[PDB]
């Protein structure tokens, strides 16, 4: 592929995903999204080799709940990612529209998330920040993970390994917590620990301090509570999420 | 123990370790360090329960290369940690004094670090930020770990689990990298990826880009290079560090 193979259209995502444009392959008329990375920025971050490893892996994967990387190319000053276009926008936008999701829509999204996250773990696909703004919606309204772009909270910079500075610390156990947070936010309309200040949000997470509105049913409460465990080893596994009674009863 | 059991002396560590004072137990005249934590701060951080778990574990441990927690107590507004006093200051101060350490001193410190870190892993002791400022020196010049006090580099706050916000992500593999960085800094006088800007330091870590001065011997180069692996699973284990030829040849 070359730049000249594409007509470049309107920018996508208001810069939240970097320089991304709606695009069309000129000969086939196929609609896709093209992400433009500047080599000077990649070089200054030291991420060229890590990016190569990741896109190599992604370009060989297919899964209905992971945003697809069709391929990639480069020129003298840029690297170009050829991405699946998700026509229905982000889950964030949908939640903004509806205020909150019903039990069917939520259980279906959680199944799809669990399936995507399982597949990422088995195929060693790095993902970085699971939240509604990073979740896209396909033609049939199926959820697609898109969280691939990239003193500290991990300690002092000079002493930190590449996996910390490259955002590669979301392992299976971390993801279980994320899934609990997402299940709550889908049903309620806001994540469980949200507060006006960062300090207060910090406090609430550490204390695992949250409340369920009355409209949240017993089954949904059981799921969420079993995911949001302070002790990582105690969290309900992805396999166990897929077999949870509430998930079985409600997922499309 | 109660506050009235202690004479409180000069502040220690210039606030880098919080409110810490040289102290003496009044009846025995024993010299120690007393750390004062304000309950209002603990409450606002949401760390009361996590602190309890950690000090409970620590107060039952003894190891020559881990700073000892003798015990703890509280009153209406404060929690007090009764700590071992390390009379010879920090490894940072010593490195500042000498500019760099010889192979004997370095190998001995690395053995001691490896032993401390191994013991922490086996007894499930959390430690948070391995660097020379957090390493203290005992009466006989033995090294003692003291790194126990506490958009982000890990992602978006509302979606992060307690282990990320509580600084509990330094596992065995992370520690291997830290040990490589420390070995280099002991021998050279600065950590391998140090740069004027955070961005340039970031770049150097991700690229694993560093150079050895001429005075660094083949054996030390082999050790350091085998620890500083981009791929976490490839790093030399703590057991393998203790059996490395350079360590065997040089450690006191
Ligand atoms: C497989 O998707 C990716 C794969 C990789 C990377 C990436 O940047 N990797 C990376 C880049 C530099 C350094 C380190 C990692 C990014 C994405 N994805 C994206 O950036 C999403 C673009 S927004 C969008 N896309 C389609 N349809 C929509 N409606 C929207 Br809105
Ligand atoms: C076993 O050592 C600790 C155990 C625990 C904590 C701690 O704060 N935990 C904690 C507090 C709040 C929230 C979460 C964790 C801190 C330390 N240690 C320290 O603070 C070191 C004090 S400086 C010093 N000490 C002795 N001799 C010297 N020459 C110096 Br200088």
Strands A31-38 and A69-74: unpaired
Find the A232 Cα to ligand 1 centroid distance in Å.
29
- Domain assignments of chain A as residue spans, ordered by start: 1-89, 90-251
In contact, A236 and A183? CB cutoff 8 Å: no
Q: Which of B54, B63, B39, B188 is nearest to B114 (CA)?
A: B63
**Cα four-point dihedral sign B212, B213, B219, B224:** negative
The resolution of the experimental structure, rounded to one decimal in Å, is 1.8
Q: Experimental method used, please?
A: X-ray
Distance separating alpha carbons of residues B143 and A130, to the nearest angstrom? 41
In DSSP notation, A25-40 reads ETTT--EEEEEEEEHH
In contact, B223 and B106? CB cutoff 8 Å: no
What phi and psi, each to the nearest 5 degrees, are found at residue A116? -60, -45
CA A15 to chain centre: 16
Q: Give the strands of the sheet with B69-74, arranged side by side.
A: B6-11, B19-25, B31-38, B78-83, B69-74
User: Which chain B residues in 150-189 lie under 8 Å from chain A, judged by CB atoms?
Assistant: 152-167, 169-170, 173-174, 177-178, 181-182
In contact, B115 and A126? CB cutoff 8 Å: no
For the record, the structure tokens of B99 come out as 């500019």
Q: Which residues of B are annotated as a binding site for ATP?
A: 16, 35, 83-86, 133-134, 147
Q: Choose one of A63, A83, A126, A165 to mutate for the ligand 1 pocket test, by most ligand atoms within 8 angstroms of C-beta.
A: A83
Which helix (H) or strand (E) segment is B10 a member of? strand B6-11
Place of tokens 């580099």: B153
In DSSP notation, B53-112 reads HHHHHHTT---TTB--EEEEEE-SSEEEEEE---TT-BHHHHHHHHSS--HHHHHHHHHH
In DSSP notation, A192-209 reads TT--SSHHHHHHHHHHT-
In contact, A158 and A148? CB cutoff 8 Å: no
CATH number of A1-89: 3.30.200.20
Distance separating alpha carbons of residues B148 and B120, to the nearest angstrom? 11
Q: Which residues of chain B neighbour A43 with C-beta distances below 8 Å?
A: 203
In contact, A126 and A150? CB cutoff 8 Å: no
In contact, B161 and A174? CB cutoff 8 Å: yes
Q: Do the domains spanning A1-89 and A90-251 agree at the CATH topology level?
A: no
For the record, the structure tokens of A52 come out as 């190569």
Distance separating alpha carbons of residues B7 and B21, to the nearest angstrom? 10
Q: Which residues of chain A neighbour B206 with C-beta distances below 8 Å?
A: 45-47, 50, 162, 165-166
A141 SS3 class: coil
- Nearest residue in chain A measured CA to CA from B149: A155
For the record, the structure tokens of A183 come out as 């299940």
Q: Among B45, B154, B193, whose Cβ lies nearest the Cβ of A206?
A: B45
Q: Does the structural domain B90-251 have CATH classification 3.30.70.260?
A: no
Q: Is A173 buried (19+), middle (13-18) or exposed (0-12) by CB count in 10 A?
A: middle
Strand partners, A11: A21
List Cβ neighbours of B137 (8 Å cut-off, separation of 6 or more). B86, B87, B88, B89, B90, B91, B94, B143, B144
A139 SS3 class: coil
Place of tokens 């971390």: A174
Distance separating alpha carbons of residues A86 and A71, to the nearest angstrom? 16
Distance separating alpha carbons of residues B115 and B202, to the nearest angstrom? 29
Strand partners, B71: B82
Considering only CA atoms, which residue is closest to atom 31 of ligand 1?
A13
Distance separating alpha carbons of residues A139 and B238, to the nearest angstrom? 51
In contact, A112 and A142? CB cutoff 8 Å: yes
Q: For chain B, what percentages of helix, strand and coil (3-state, to nearest 5) are there?
A: 45, 15, 40
Q: A161 vs B129, B148, B175, B192, CA distance in Å?
A: 12, 19, 9, 12
What is the signed CA dihedral for A86, A103, A229, B118, rounded to 10 degrees?
-30
B2 SS3 class: coil
For the record, the structure tokens of B180 come out as 């490589």
For the record, the structure tokens of A40 come out as 């000077």
Q: Is A196 an interface residue toward B (CB < 8 Å)?
A: no
List Cβ neighbours of B223 (8 Å cut-off, separation of 6 or more). B110, B180, B183, B236, B241, B244, B246, B247
Beta carbons of A158 and B181 less than 8 Å apart: yes
For the record, the structure tokens of A219 come out as 């089954």
Q: Would you tell me the crossing angle of helices A172-188 and A218-227 to the nearest 10 degrees?
A: 150
Q: How close is the nearest chain B Cα to the Cα of A166, in Å?
A: 7
Q: Which residues of chain B neighbour A162 with C-beta distances below 8 Å?
A: 205-206, 208, 230
Q: Is B47 an interface residue toward A (CB < 8 Å)?
A: yes
Is B175 an annotated catalytic residue? no
Beta carbons of B203 and A230 less than 8 Å apart: no
In contact, B167 and B128? CB cutoff 8 Å: yes
Distance separating alpha carbons of residues B89 and B133, to the nearest angstrom? 9
Distance separating alpha carbons of residues B70 and B60, to the nearest angstrom? 8
């Amino acid at each position: 592929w070359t730049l000249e193979d594409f007509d470049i259209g309107r920018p996508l995502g208001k810069g939240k995903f970097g320089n991304v444009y709606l695009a069309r392959e000129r000969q086939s008329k196929f609609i896709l999204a093209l992400k433009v990375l500047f080599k000077t920025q990649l070089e200054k971050a030291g991420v060229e080799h890590q990016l190569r490893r990741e896109v190599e892996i992604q370009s060989h994967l297919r899964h209905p709940n992971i945003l697809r990387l069709y391929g990639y190319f480069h020129d003298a000053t840029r690297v170009y990612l050829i991405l699946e276009y998700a026509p229905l926008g982000t889950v964030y936008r949908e939640l903004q529209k509806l205020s909150r999701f019903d039990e069917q829509r939520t259980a279906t999204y959680i199944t799809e998330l669990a399936n995507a996250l399982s597949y990422c773990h088995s195929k060693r696909v790095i993902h970085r920040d699971i939240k509604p703004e990073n979740l896209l919606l396909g033609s049939n309204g199926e959820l697609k993970i898109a969280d691939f772009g990239w003193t500290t909270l991990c300690g002092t910079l000079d002493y930190l390994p590449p996996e910390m500075i490259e955002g590669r610390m979301h392992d299976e156990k971390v993801d279980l917590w994320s899934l609990g947070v997402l299940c709550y936010e889908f049903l309620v309309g806001m994540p469980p620990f949200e507060a006006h200040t960062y300090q207060e949000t910090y406090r609430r997470i550490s204390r695992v301090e949250f409340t369920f509105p009355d409209f949240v049913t017993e089954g949904a409460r059981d799921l969420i509570s079993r995911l949001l465990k302070h002790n990582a080893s105690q969290r309900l596994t992805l396999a166990e999420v897929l077999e949870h009674p509430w998930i079985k009863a409600n997922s499309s």
